[PDB]
Amino acid sequence: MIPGGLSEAKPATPEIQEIVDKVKPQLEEKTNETYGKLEAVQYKTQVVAGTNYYIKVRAGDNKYMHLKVFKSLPGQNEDLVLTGYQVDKNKDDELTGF
Amino acid sequence: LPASFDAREQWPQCPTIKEIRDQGSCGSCWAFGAVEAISDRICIHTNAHVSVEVSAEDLLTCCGSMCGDGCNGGYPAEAWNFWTRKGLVSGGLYESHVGCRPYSIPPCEHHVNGSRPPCTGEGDTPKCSKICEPGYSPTYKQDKHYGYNSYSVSNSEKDIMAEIYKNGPVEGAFSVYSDFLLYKSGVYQHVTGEMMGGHAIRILGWGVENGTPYWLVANSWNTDWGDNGFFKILRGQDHCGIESEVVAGIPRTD
Structure with missing residues (x-):
């Protein structure tokens, strides 16, 4: 019940998938790269004044990539925004607070 | 001992008790609570002579790793x-001026800049200074x-009411x-949902809506969420662990 930490890991779903695609354009311009599809597999959530998502996406070869996305609170609206990526990461890393 | 207790009414001379802070993009709820x-x-214990908004930056950046x-x-x-x-030093001090170590991590509610990206900025614990x-x-x-001292409160409904009424708001998780996150009105009570994670908050009293006995709580996410910042959660059963994590302490000097 770590009062500010990230939840244990959860197998990805299509919601976590709608995010990676909604913030696709946003990751695109920062690395300047072009991906056919970011494919989420793992994720953690965390309670801030909103929820941060720590998603594990697959890029090209056999190496994965990490993504911190802030997700607004019902009140404000349904937003989303890359706040921090973590390109060039390993196949098997724990998702870790960054 | 009373049926209904609210610290904002018992000690109105203390701004901080009616204030809601915006925690931003990072898990410092433990520091804010x-x-x-x-x-x-501090206010309650000095009869309003000293009103300060104790430094959340200080707690976060100078306790640091510990x-x-x-x-x-x-x-x-x-x-x-x-x-x-x-x-801890300040981050708000009363008679206006401004605190010692205010909270630098930008907020998540408001909009600001020019078109909504409120937080999504620093979100990186600064250094102790x-x-x-x-x-x-x-x-x-x-x-x-x-x-002076700090201690845990017991997983008991009364000790908690008795810590609050006798000494002021407390911390819990x-x-x-x-x-x-859907909360707006009434007494919250958990029914479904994905476990998002563990959060920390400020309990400052009690009462009943229809039949449900609740704890008065200040969330740290700004004033649009919920009830102008606050909510009510089921009180009685340790519902979601709200009695299991209560901690307080008594201010030194007064």
Whole structure:
């Protein structure tokens, strides 16, 4: 019940998938790269004044990539925004607070 | 002992008790819960003579590694112990001016800049700096406000009412579940949801709506969410762990 930490890991779903695609354009311009599809597999959530998502996406070869996305609170609206990526990461890393 | 208790009504001369802070993009709820109760308790304990908004930046950046992992979690019972050991400076001081060490991590509610991206900026625990950010007098190690003792409260409904009524708001923690971000009115009660994670908050009283006995709580996410900042959660059963994590302490000098 770590009062500010990230939840244990959860197998990805299509919601976590709608995010990676909604913030696709946003990751695109920062690395300047072009991906056919970011494919989420793992994720953690965390309670801030909103929820941060720590998603594990697959890029090209056999190496994965990490993504911190802030997700607004019902009140404000349904937003989303890359706040921090973590390109060039390993196949098997724990998702870790960054 | 009373049926209904609200600290904002019992000690109205203390701004901080009616104030809601915006925690931003990082998991410092543990730091806010502690410094806001501590802020509250300093006022109550001096009869309003001293009104300060104790430094959340200080708790976060100067307890640092010893109280958790900054913006990635942390511990209530540790934030409070550190107030006792090394104390905390300000980030809001009453008669207007401005605090010693205010909260630099930008907020998540408001909009600002030009088109909504509120947070998504620094979100990176800054360093400990035993300096007041300039313009505030006096000096850091003199703005320091200390605690006498700190202790856990018991998983008991009455001890909690008795800690609040006798000494002021306290800190606690519970488990958030997606149905909770949806909160607006009434007494919250967990029914479904994905386990989002563990959050920390400020309990400041009690009462009943229809039949449900609740705890008055200040969330740290700004004033649009919920009830102008606050909510009510089921009180009686330790519902989501809200009784299991209660911690307080008593201010030093007064």
